């Protein structure tokens with residue numbers, strides 16, 4: 001189970017070191033350069049919640065997913081996680097709810113206290 005493999009073999013990339021965001025790398029990228037806060041970032045991803053009740057992908061178009069890193073435009077987990085990734089990398093994250101949607105959740109899509117899993121490919125980044 002990709003999520004179990006991460007829960008068991010994944011690196012804790014939080015600062016508080018509370019296992020709230022766990023990472024395994026799946027395809028090593030190119031270079032040493034990983035993006036900076038305020039970079040426009042381009043990714044393809046697949047995401048599910050632990051309930052198994054919802055699944056989302058960017059792949060539900062050709063359009064890639066585009067955000068400004070570190071600006072809280074996404075969940076904290078992504079601002080943390082993607083910032084560790086190199087151009088061309090693919091990685092798995094498992095996220096406790098405190099780094100996703102927390103106790104409030106985001107109903108009706110995300111319930112209260114949900115745990116999330118993502119597969120992420122980092123295509124490229126550029127300074128805004």
Ligand SMILES: CCCn1cc(COC(=O)[C@@H]2CCCCN2C(=O)[C@H](c2cc(OC)c(OC)c(OC)c2)C2CCCCC2)cn1
Nearest residue numbers: 047048049054055056066067073074075078106109110116
């Ligand atoms: C500038 C991008 C702004 N944006 C933020 C979001 C909120 O989503 C997230 O921050 C994270 C990480 C970025 C990819 C989408 N994210 C999600 O959680 C998905 C997500 C996709 C969504 O649609 C693509 C979405 O609606 C906007 C949403 O709302 C909370 C959350 C979940 C993953 C669990 C399975 C169901 C969806 C959606 N668009």
